[PDB]
């Protein structure tokens, strides 16, 4: 009942050019608070690497599938192969406490144990078989239906969207 609030971080999402809204994120610090501080300054866009500012303004969700997930935060090579992290290179996995129980949720993508970076996804449907491999993280605890906006968008081969599905914006709330 007194315990501080975690931090909050909003999406403003845009779909073929034209905003379709803002989703905002809770930041479960209380729970993964080393993979939620690494999103949390991809947020602001002020966080530096080797000077120059990198983070989620202006990246893509490269993969959208219905009913199951929708992928992005790869504002190195925009294609789901980047990676990047504020400790450098990749990190370990925070902590498996949490579940993909719910349509919702934001997890770490990875390619294997320990390496995560700054990709993610977030849950359209449960998705159990991901427990104990990704770090869950955080949730969408308003606009959710940005994220069915998203998950309607038409894809094309490998599911990629034929629309550009953008982080227009975003930051701190």
């Known amino acids: 009942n ?95 406490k949490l579940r993909h129980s719910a349509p919702g949720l934001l997890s770490m993508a990875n390619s294997g144990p320990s390496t995560n970076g700054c990709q993610f996804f977030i849950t359209c449907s449960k998705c159990d078989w991901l427990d104990g491999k990704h770090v869950v993280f955080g949730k969408i605890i308003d606009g959710l239906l940005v994220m069915r906006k998203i998950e309607n968008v038409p894809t094309g081969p490998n599911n990629k969207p034929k629309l550009p599905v953008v982080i227009s914006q975003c930051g701190e709330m």
Do not use: W
């Open 2 to 96: 007194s315990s501080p609030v975690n931090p909050v971080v909003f999406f403003d999402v845009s779909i073929g050019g034209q905003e379709v809204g803002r989703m905002k994120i809770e930041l479960f610090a209380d729970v993964v608070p080393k993979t939620a501080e690494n999103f949390r300054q991809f947020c602001t866009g002020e966080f530096r690497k080797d000077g120059v500012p990198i983070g989620y303004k202006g990246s893509t969700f490269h993969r959208v599938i219905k009913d199951f997930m929708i992928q992005g935060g790869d504002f190195v090579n925009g294609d789901g192969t980047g990676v990047a992290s504020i400790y450098r290179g990749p990190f370990a996995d925070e902590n498996f």
